[PDB]
From Swiss-Prot:
Organism for this UniProt entry: Saccharomyces cerevisiae (strain ATCC 204508 / S288c) (Baker's yeast)
Residue stretches making up the SH3 domain: 1-61
Domain of life: Eukaryota
Modification comment: Phosphorylation probably activates the myosin-I ATPase.
Range of the intact protein held here: 1122 to 1189 of 1272
Further details from the record: Present with 155 molecules/cell in log phase SD medium.
Name of the protein in its database record: Myosin-3
Protein location: Cytoplasm, Cytoskeleton, Actin patch
Gene: MYO3
Quaternary structure note: Interacts (via myosin motor domain) with SHE4; this interaction is important for proper localization and may regulate the interaction of the motor domain with actin. Interacts (via SH3 domain) with VRP1; this interaction is required for localization to sites of polarized growth and may regulate the interaction of the tail domain with actin. Interacts (via SH3 domain) with PAN1; this interaction is important for late stages of endocytopsis. Interacts (via SH3 domain) with BBC1 and LAS17. Interacts (via C-terminal acidic tail) with ARC19 and ARC40; ARC19 and ARC40 are Arp2/3 complex subunits.
């Protein structure tokens, strides 16, 4: 799966269907839905929950800018 970066805080409502984020957090994304929500998983796989698709931006580290 691809990795996405939280561009905004998402403290959410408290729901266990929600994955609360801080800015700069990095997650996997398995599903986007038309409601505007994305199904995010932490990198260690410990929690799974929906997040605002809008907050989620492709992760680019500056160590990724080399061919191999």
């Amino acid at each position: 799966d691809p990795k996405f970066e939280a561009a905004y805080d998402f403290p959410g409502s408290g729901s266990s269907s929600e994955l609360p984020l801080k800015k700069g957090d990095i997650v996997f994304i398995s599903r986007d839905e038309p409601s505007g929500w994305s199904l995010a998983k932490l990198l260690d796989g410990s929690k799974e929950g929906w997040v605002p698709t809008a907050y989620m931006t492709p992760y680019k580290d500056t160590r990724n800018t080399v061919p191999v």
